[PDB]
Amino acid sequence: SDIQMTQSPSSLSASVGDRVTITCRASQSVSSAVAWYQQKPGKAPKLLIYSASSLYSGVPSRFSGSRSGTDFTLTISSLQPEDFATYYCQQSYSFPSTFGQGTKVEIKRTVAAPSVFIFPPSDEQLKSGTASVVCLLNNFYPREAKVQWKVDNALQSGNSQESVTEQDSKDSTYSLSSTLTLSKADYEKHKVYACEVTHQGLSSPVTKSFNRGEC
Amino acid sequence: SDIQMTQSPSSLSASVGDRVTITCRASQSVSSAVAWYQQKPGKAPKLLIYSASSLYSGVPSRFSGSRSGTDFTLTISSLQPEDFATYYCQQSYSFPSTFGQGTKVEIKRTVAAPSVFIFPPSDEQLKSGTASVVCLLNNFYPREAKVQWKVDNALQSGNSQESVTEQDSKDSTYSLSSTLTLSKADYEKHKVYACEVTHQGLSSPVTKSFNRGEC
Amino acid sequence: EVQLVESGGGLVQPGGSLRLSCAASGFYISYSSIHWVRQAPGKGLEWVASISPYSGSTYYADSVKGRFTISADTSKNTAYLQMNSLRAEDTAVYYCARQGYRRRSGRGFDYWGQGTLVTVSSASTKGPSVFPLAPSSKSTSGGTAALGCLVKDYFPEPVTVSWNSGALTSGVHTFPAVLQSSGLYSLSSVVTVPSSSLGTQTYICNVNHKPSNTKVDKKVEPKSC
Amino acid sequence: EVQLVESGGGLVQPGGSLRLSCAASGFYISYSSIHWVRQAPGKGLEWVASISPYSGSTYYADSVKGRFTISADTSKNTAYLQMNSLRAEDTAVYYCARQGYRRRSGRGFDYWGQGTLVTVSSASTKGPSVFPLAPSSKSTSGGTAALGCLVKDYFPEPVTVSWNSGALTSGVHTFPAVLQSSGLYSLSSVVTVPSSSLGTQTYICNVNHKPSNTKVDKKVEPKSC
RNA sequence: GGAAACUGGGUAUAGGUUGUUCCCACCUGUACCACCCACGUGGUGUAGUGCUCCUGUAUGAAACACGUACACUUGCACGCCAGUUUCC
RNA sequence: GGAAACUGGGUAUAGGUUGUUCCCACCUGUACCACCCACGUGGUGUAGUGCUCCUGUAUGAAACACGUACACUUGCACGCCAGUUUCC
């Protein structure tokens, strides 16, 4: 039976100078063959801790790790701006090696309402026979938003997708794009295309919309 | 001012396979600059742990160290007989460096009776005008024994001194010598010199004796 | 000084096979264990395989049993991963990692390659079509406007978006791509700009999809309906 | 290969001075911190002083400041402890210890010398007399008998007992010295042997008391008639 | 199209100017409220550059000192965005 | 006191018994009772030596394998001790 490393929390929000601790539990004993890694988006992992509590050379002393039974904790005693990243534990006590699911560390900040933009399908794409409606939520916080499309007041299911940016390095906000895709034939059957945004920065849901052909 | 390292217990006994833990609490923070050392009686200390939780190369993995705040524990997960030693913590976070008082660890084992020998003063020593009568208690356990000198059945007081070997790190037995000191004049006033030993390996006390001048 | 470079990645048909290679510099692989670790888009690290020094022993995640083969050619300082019977599930970035020296970093993986993307899909290489997200004739939101480019129906990943050949960066968001039911990716790139610049400034997005050598520049304007 | 050897210890009058030396081999002392640590008989380790590499900075325990002076002769690979105004309290075994490499063992002291005993006392050196502890007059046990050497009335410590010039080691117990009310130490060393080995084995204890250059060999036998 | 000069956190509110339209490009006092400091009776468009200043971090056989690399925080100048004002 | 040969944990007991006077030894059975294993229908003087076997620990650029060192445990041989018998 493979050793499972259960890592918690899966994400946490903190501000610079804070002390974070990430825990990681071995399903069965691993003694001390635990490593921790820091990964930033688009980059390879970097080793931080080995043998559960030993600071890898070149790594700042604000990182440390400790072991208590089958519990392993990574601690950052005082968060620096370069420490927002994802962190993984790893057992190497026996093969197969096992990684934790990861913990994402994010910048806390004041709530910021999304700004909603709606964008109708372009003339060029309608030539292709397909119609895409894009809704933008810009520079908001926290990350949680819910966007549902209504087309002539019918809530849409299963024909739009979202995508969210990484947290902005300067102002710590997220942005989110939602795209609703219809065949141009099916598009021409309705008139009012709306994006309804609920976010905790919004004291009541925002609706942005347009009418097909009337701009 | 100076950082104080407080170590507990100051002594302990346990048997092979037991898990021993020695704690050591630093008054004010030392971060992670703690080392543990094993000193066997009469020998230089040997490093065991550094940076509070890193296993020094060559040291058995049944040794480990952990840190929690200003508390440091050395753990031996499975006691081997050769782990009889005194163990010291040490802070090296700021000068002056500080050691804890040490924890002396000895091995529990099955009761073992002493074998008693008595030794009369040599002719050479009696030339000088002094008599030393030696009682030997060999390879016993536990450490507590009681040795009474009788000179013609007069229980002797205040004229003998004891010495006990370090616990055998191999079979964990002790040996003990008792030395009775009389002037040659006082020695020659009596005939029957006896050593009486009570120890719990003995179902009743053993006496070894001799007669002065009787070969 | 010390580094590892994976190559051999790319697009593979389902049921296909691929041999990744991991070329070492700054040290000799015969003294280290070498590991392969992969990462599906948006997911954690998954250990794949490893090889022992001095013994040649090999270990495999159960999820690649019977399909992957790790190996090492020490006269090139290069490690290899032979992948067979590839399924879409094996789409990930693949890293090779060196287990560091025992006395110095335990069993930690102390150096990692930048990793090579492997894409398992029966879809065919195709450059994107790019459409403008025109700033609203009336009112996208208000204040300062938003505009963008929809980079739709491309394969495989990745795609590069820049704005005005890199000279406008502030307020730009290029979103993570989303894989559609058609098997083609789609992403959008957006920019927010002064509302007063709209009458005086043209905004053109530069899309580059290297697997098909397609560069498309798209000028985005307010619509005139 | 790496080792440290202290010398210069011995017996000193109160208010006297003494220079300890610590001669290193297998490594160069200028790339390490060097520490002096002492241990009063029957007590713990006490840190005394240290000297830093590249700068020569020195640090002193509170109780020896202004009287002890640590220094290092990097051209002889030796460290020194100048002890002046020696007080009664300064009786201890004195170790020099190397602080290990930062990257390899933190601040731990990874090699230690065997130590040199320093004894502060206005008392006078005296060699032991060695007396036979003769095997059993009545042949006590038909199994193994005991014999030994009584090493009496010496000062200061220490004294070494060996058997048959080291050729007999099994079953030897050399007891800790005991301070008699006279101010002289006394110990015995004992050994068990087959009772039949008497008359067929010569047993000689070799007593060496270096503080007075006394070497005594004592052959031990059952008494006569 | 040139050339120049000047200005710079919101938010309220009292003024000044601006054409006159009641608000403007603005700008000053004040309150409130932020971000930032090395924390004051202080500072305020800015993911760029240089110098500087404040610390921190890593590392050099390295607890201090010394070297190097990297970050940080002042202040300044240039560049950049946003405006005005002016002149050809 | 020499030299050889034989035997090897107690304990208790039925005993037996240098074939001779109870029985010292010898010699077992039995019940026991311990110590030690790799735990059986098991083994049984032993801090010596060689080899063997069982593992553990540490280390060699080293998770397994392989080397080296150290410990651990089987057994055998030789030594040593304890008897015993025998002769000188």
DSSP code per residue over B17-28:
TPPEEEEEEESS
* Residues of C whose CB is below 8 A from A8: none
Strand locations in B31-173 (E)? 34-39, 46-50, 54-55, 63-68, 71-76, 85-91, 98-99, 103-107, 115-119, 130-140, 146-151, 154-155, 160-164
Distance CA A76, CA A78 (A): 6
Does residue C5 contact residue C114 with C-beta atoms inside 8 Å?
A: yes
- At CB < 8 A and 24+ separation, what contacts does A41-49 make? A41/A166, A43/C114, A44/C95, A44/C112, A44/C113, A44/C114, A44/C115, A45/A88, A45/C37, A45/C45, A45/C95, A45/C97, A45/C109, A45/C112, A46/C112, A47/C100, A47/C105, A47/C108, A47/C109, A47/C110, A48/A74, A48/A87, A49/A74, A49/C108
Chains in contact with D, where contact requires at least 3 CB pairs less than 8 Å apart: B, C
**Based on C-alpha coordinates, what's the Rg of chain D?**
22
Does residue D21 contact residue D33 with C-beta atoms inside 8 Å?
A: no
Q: Between the CA of A107 and the C1' of E36, what is the distance in angstroms?
A: 18
Structural domains of chain B sorted by starting position, each given as residue range(s) with its CATH number in brackets: 5-108 (2.60.40.10), 115-210 (2.60.40.10)
C110: number of Cβ within 10 Å? 22
Q: Counting Cβ atoms within 10 Å, is residue D28 exposed (0-12), middle (13-18) or buried (19+)?
A: exposed
Structural domains of chain C sorted by starting position, each given as residue range(s) with its CATH number in brackets: 3-120 (2.60.40.10), 129-220 (2.60.40.10)
Distance CA A148, CA A150 (A): 7
Residue with tokens 């370090």: B166
Distance CA C76, CA C7 (A): 14
A16 nearest nt, CA–C1': E72
Are the Cβ atoms of B66 and A64 closer than 8 angstroms?
Answer: no
Distance CA A9, CA A7 (A): 6
- Chain B: closest CA distance from residue D148 (Å): 9
Alpha carbon of B158 to those of B86, B119, B165, B182, C107: distances in Å?
A: 32, 19, 22, 11, 63
DSSP C124-149: --B--EEEEEPPPSS-SSSSSEEEEE
Alpha carbon of D188 to those of B132, C205, D4: distances in Å?
A: 11, 96, 31
List bases, strand F, within 7 Å of protein CB.
35, 47-48, 57-66, 80-83
D151: number of Cβ within 10 Å? 26
Selected residues 187-216 of chain C with any CB under 8 Å from a CB in chain A? 187-188, 190, 192
Beta partners for residue A4, in sequence order: none
Residue with tokens 């539990």: A25
- Asked if C195 CB < 7 A from strand E, the reply is no
Measured between CB atoms, does C129 come within 8 Å of chain A?
yes
Stated in angstroms to one decimal place, the resolution of this structure is 2.5
Upper half-sphere CA count for residue B153 (Cβ side, 13 Å): 0
Does residue C79 contact residue C71 with C-beta atoms inside 8 Å?
A: yes
Q: Between the CA of C160 and the C1' of E68, what is the distance in angstroms?
A: 38
- Chain D: closest CA distance from residue C28 (Å): 22
Distance CA C174, CA A41 (A): 14
Q: Between the CA of D204 and the C1' of F78, what is the distance in angstroms?
A: 28
**Based on C-alpha coordinates, what's the Rg of chain C?**
22
- Closest by CA position to B44, among listed C167, A26, D85, D5: D5
Measured between CB atoms, does C224 come within 8 Å of chain A?
no
* Amino acid code (one letter) for D154: Y
* Residues of B whose CB is below 8 A from A54: 51, 53-54
Are the Cβ atoms of B163 and D176 closer than 8 angstroms?
Answer: yes
Selected residues 28-57 of chain C with any CB under 8 Å from a CB in chain A? 35, 37, 44-47, 50
The 3-state secondary structure of B116-134 reads EEEECCCHHHHHCCEEEEE
- Asked if B51 CB < 7 A from strand E, the reply is no
Q: Which experiment gave this structure?
A: X-ray
Alpha carbon of B115 to those of B202, D61, D168: distances in Å?
A: 10, 47, 21
Torsion angle of C-alpha atoms A186, A190, A192, A198, degrees rounded to 10: -50
User: What sign has the CA pseudo-torsion D92, D95, D99, D104?
Assistant: negative
* Residues of B whose CB is below 8 A from D100: 47, 50
**Based on C-alpha coordinates, what's the Rg of chain B?**
23
Measured between CB atoms, does B32 come within 8 Å of chain A?
yes
